[PDB]
């Protein structure tokens, strides 16, 4: 279709290809919604191939793509108002991923990223995360936002809020964390779990629709790995690092106490301890302003300094009156 | 709480003053008590607002700009609370759509081979189709 309607072939093909760029994006999202567990290899060959085509189109027709991308965000927001998590689907996770590919995420303001980043942060907070399928949906979202801020490394408060509840949710309370608001106490991991077997930390998108202990452990590991990266990149630089990590430090401590064999929290805890040791938590001083100079004014003068008409009429009457009077005398 | 003048460094300060300033930095400990229930005994006045310092790096641009005010001189007499109180996630999105200034969309020069990781360059390691 792109070949048959290139811009040079006939007039108006730019507009048609521009709309096709928007149509192509909806197709990429549309396919992800459809079940593909039967032919995952075939779906993998088509989905990435279509994305590559979309990237080439986006280079020339970003404007048409930008309009469609914003429209999807508004449509998805409207569906969230009514159906909440039921509106969300696999394609919605895919859609956010595509935006990262085709747009510059590390910008302070952007047409598509900023609505998308705001909308994702709403899911990380508003959504209940009371089921394994819902938590798995959150784990993917945390990864997306982390890649959005891969260079900017901005601070996302919801990421902190998401980590606290999910880590606590798998330990349900221990009665030492009453400040963290849980939404499901029945997801508590059993004690007999080993945590020593090599379990894949990758969450397949198709599994979310299907969604026991092994799946619960795998989701927890993926969330915990994302936590480790966030501590290393974003929170480490922030001035309030000790405050952000203090609640998480208590939660990780509970994991080590309950599951001695489990190694990931200890590695994070050792890592967190290393950062707090080096960082110098000194009283911030932000009000040291540069002194303001005395005011300056430009002088007022004439470029060619010289040492209405009624006045000129009056002026000349004086000269003539004096110059008449001498004649009379 | 926003700033302690004693910890500011001056270029004219003598080397002994530099040494004394260094020792003060090493010995500092935050005295604020989070569990104390009496607001007069929490020692907050001796502590400082590091939490507000982080917020200037908030992802949203306008929220970051508001946090930057504490780094600016306090010229304004007050801020009208009613203009900030009842904001919602929906309001931010709607306000974002109805933006006075419209910008051009930009594109990323870096290229990723596969959006999701397998079960060359991967945009989302740890997520698979």
């Amino acid at each position: 279709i792109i070949k048959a309607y290139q811009p040079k072939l006939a007039e108006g093909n730019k507009e048609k290809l521009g709309k096709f760029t928007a149509v192509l994006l909806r197709h990429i999202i549309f396919l992800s919604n459809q079940n593909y567990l039967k032919n995952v290899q075939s779906f993998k060959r088509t989905q990435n191939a279509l994305i590559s085509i979309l990237k080439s189109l986006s280079e020339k027709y970003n404007r048409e793509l930008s309009e469609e991308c914003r429209d999807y965000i508004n449509e998805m927001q409207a569906r969230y108002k009514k159906n909440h998590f039921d509106a969300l689907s696999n394609g919605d996770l895919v859609f956010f991923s595509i935006i990262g590919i085709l747009f510059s995420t590390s910008d302070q303001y952007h047409l598509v990223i900023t609505p998308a980043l705001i909308l994702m942060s709403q899911f990380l907070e508003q959504i209940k995360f009371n089921s394994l399928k819902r938590i798995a949906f959150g784990a993917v979202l945390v990864r997306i936002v982390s890649q959005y801020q891969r260079i900017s490394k901005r601070y996302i408060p919801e990421v902190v809020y998401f980590f606290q509840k999910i880590l606590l949710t798998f330990i349900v309370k221990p009665l030492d964390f009453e400040n963290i608001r849980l939404d499901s106490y029945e997801l508590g991991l059993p004690l007999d779990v080993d945590f020593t077997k090599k379990r894949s930390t990758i969450i397949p998108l198709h599994t979310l629709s299907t969604m026991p202990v092994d799946q619960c452990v795998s989701v927890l590991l993926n969330v915990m790995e994302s936590l480790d990266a966030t501590i290393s990149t974003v929170w480490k630089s922030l001035p309030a690092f000790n405050e952000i990590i203090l609640p998480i430090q208590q939660l990780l401590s509970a994991y080590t106490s309950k599951y001695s064999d489990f190694e990931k929290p200890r590695n994070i805890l050792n890592k967190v301890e290393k950062l707090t040791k080096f960082t110098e938590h000194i009283p911030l001083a932000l009000q040291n302003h540069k002194p303001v100079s005395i005011p300056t004014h430009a002088p007022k003068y004439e470029e060619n300094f010289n040492p209405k008409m009624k006045a000129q009429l009056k002026k000349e009457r004086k000269f003539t009156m004096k110059e008449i009077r001498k004649d009379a005398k | 709480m926003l700033h302690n003048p004693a910890f500011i460094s001056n270029p004219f300060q003598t080397p002994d003053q530099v040494a004394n300033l260094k020792t003060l930095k090493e010995n500092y400990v935050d005295p604020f008590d989070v569990h104390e229930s009496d607001p007069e005994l929490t020692h907050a006045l001796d502590s400082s607002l590091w939490e507000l310092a982080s917020l200037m790096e908030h992802y949203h641009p306008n929220v970051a700009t508001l946090a930057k005010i504490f780094a600016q001189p306090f010229k304004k007499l007050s801020y009208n609370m009613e203009d900030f109180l009842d904001w919602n996630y929906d309001s931010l999105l709607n306000a974002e759509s109805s933006r006075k200034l419209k910008t051009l969309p930009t594109l990323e020069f870096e290229a990723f081979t596969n959006v999701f990781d397998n079960e060359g360059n991967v945009y989302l390691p740890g997520v698979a189709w």
Binding site: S106, D107, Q108, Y109 | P61, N62, A95, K100, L101, T103
Partner: peptide
């Protein structure tokens, strides 16, 4: 050239070459 533009956009450069502070006028009021 491209990386330099990315750094500028990161620091608040907005291509209408405005700044993020400009976008924050009247946002909170209405």
């Amino acid at each position: 050239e491209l990386e330099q533009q990315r750094l500028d956009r990161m620091n608040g450069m907005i291509e209408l070459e405005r700044g993020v502070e400009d976008l924050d006028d009247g946002f909170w009021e209405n």
